Amino acid sequence: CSARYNLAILAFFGFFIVYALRVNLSVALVDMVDSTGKKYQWDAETQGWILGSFFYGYIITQIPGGYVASKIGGKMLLGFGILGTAVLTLFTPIAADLGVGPLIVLRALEGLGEGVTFPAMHAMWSSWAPPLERSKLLSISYAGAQLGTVISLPLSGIICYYMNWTYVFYFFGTIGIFWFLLWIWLVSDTPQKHKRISHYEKEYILSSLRNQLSSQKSVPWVPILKSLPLWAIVVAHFSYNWTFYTLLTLLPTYMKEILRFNVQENGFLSSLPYLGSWLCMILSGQAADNLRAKWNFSTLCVRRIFSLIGMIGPAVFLVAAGFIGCDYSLAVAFLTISTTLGGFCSSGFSINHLDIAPSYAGILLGITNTFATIPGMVGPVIAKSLTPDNTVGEWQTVFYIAAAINVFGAIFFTLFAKGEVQNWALN
Numbered sequence: 001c002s003a004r005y006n007l008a009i010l011a012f013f014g015f016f017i018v019y020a021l022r023v024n025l026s027v028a029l030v031d032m033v034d035s036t037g038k039k040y041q042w043d044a045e046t047q048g049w050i051l052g053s054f055f056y057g058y059i060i061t062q063i064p065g066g067y068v069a070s071k072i073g074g075k076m077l078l079g080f081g082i083l084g085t086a087v088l089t090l091f092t093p094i095a096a097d098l099g100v101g102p103l104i105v106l107r108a109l110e111g112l113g114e115g116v117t118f119p120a121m122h123a124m125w126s127s128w129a130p131p132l133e134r135s136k137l138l139s140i141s142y143a144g145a146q147l148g149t150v151i152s153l154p155l156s157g158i159i160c161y162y163m164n165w166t167y168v169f170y171f172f173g174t175i176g177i178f179w180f181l182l183w184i185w186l187v188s189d190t191p192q193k194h195k196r197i198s199h200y201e202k203e204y205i206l207s208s209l210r211n212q213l214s215s216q217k218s219v220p221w222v223p224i225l226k227s228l229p230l231w232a233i234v235v236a237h238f239s240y241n242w243t244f245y246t247l248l249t250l251l252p253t254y255m256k257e258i259l260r261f262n263v264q265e266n267g268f269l270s271s272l273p274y275l276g277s278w279l280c281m282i283l284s285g286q287a288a289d290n291l292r293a294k295w296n297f298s299t300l301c302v303r304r305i306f307s308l309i310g311m312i313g314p315a316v317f318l319v320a321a322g323f324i325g326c327d328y329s330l331a332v333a334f335l336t337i338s339t340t341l342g343g344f345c346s347s348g349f350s351i352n353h354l355d356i357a358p359s360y361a362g363i364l365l366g367i368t369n370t371f372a373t374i375p376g377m378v379g380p381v382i383a384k385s386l387t388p389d390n391t392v393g394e395w396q397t398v399f400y401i402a403a404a405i406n407v408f409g410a411i412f413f414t415l416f417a418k419g420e421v422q423n424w425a426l427n
Contacts, residue, residue, distance in 0.1 A: 003198070011078075
């Protein structure tokens with residue numbers, strides 16, 4: 001269609017692929033370990049490190065990704081940060097035969113690759129997206145990643161059921177490389193440096209970003225960010241990402257050990273949770289817009305209410321999913337509802353970083369994403385070391401810990417939550 005919307009679609013597919021490369025192992029590992037290709041003997045804790053080293057790689061280069069993106073643009077950064085991942089995924093089946101050390105190193109490198117995508121997309125959209133249309137563009141560019149998580153579980157399940165897991169890794173690596181070719185050929189870095197853009201579209205984009213940049217003054221100097229509300233956002237994001245990443249990296253293992261499912265239905269009914277989460281995030285954005293339009297609530301009561309809902313609903317329904325274990329339908333239903341009630345939190349709290357200190361979105365997002373990726377490094381290891389032999393009580397321990405963390409994060413956020421400005425964001 002247009003030029004900025006063509007860039008959206010190519011970023012949509014890019015983030016789809018990056019989340020695919022993040023979760024394909026989360027399925028291929030439950031079809032990989034030994035209790036038809038090769039099946040290694042990993043001692044119920046090696047799987048924790050293999051699942052959660054990608055997030056070491058992610059947290060290493062979250063913020064330096066933002067710096068390098070502001071420096072040398074976004075196109076090459078995102079393209080190479082997805083190509084590195086979709087090339088190391090081509091070698092994951094080869095690095096598995098070498099052992100475990102090489103596999104953890106390969107996933108740390110994949111985390112290095114995938115930690116630089118969003119900080120580059122934000123620069124590309126600071127150069128492309130007109131202010132009065134930034135919302136739809138970012139919405140598409142990240143619904144890409146959401147649909148990646150939603151669809152990457154069924155495809156991994158199917159390819160692990162009818163074929164091996166090496167085929168999962170080869171298929172996702174090949175799709176990654178094909179999209180990287182499309183993304184080097186089509187997308188450019190800035191409407192000025194675009195090859196086949198039209199005059200009127202470039203003039204529209206530039207005449208809107210003219211105001212956007214001219215209204216910016218606090219860009220060069222960076223202050224200290226030791227304010228209380230920022231640590232509230234950080235603690236809430238940490239307590240939400242704990243549950244999110246624990247589920248992301250240990251839902252197929254759960255459905256194959258406790259609930260005693262297949263691998264195909266494992267993929268399908270492991271995807272359904274995130275499909276619900278995505279639909280709920282969309283509907284929750286709509287409901288938040290409506291509730292802030294018709295009623296005021298000082299723009300902060302809505303934040304704390306949506307955080308309470310989207311962080312306690314998951315906790316209580318996760319305790320429920322843990323309580324009634326070893327049951328086919330009710331357990332997966334409670335899990336689906338528990339992670340479906342996360343869209344409330346997602347929208348009505350991850351927009352609090354925009355509302356607390358605008359024009360500083362990148363900085364605050366960088367300070368939040370690392371301290372909420374920490375769960376990616378800890379959670380899987382802890383939840384696989386607490387349950388060496390899968391029993392309903394062993395997994396109830398994990399679910400209880402996750403729900404308690406959710407409740408604590410919700411309390412800590414709704415307590416010290418501010419929403420107008422913190423006296424260091426004014427230009």
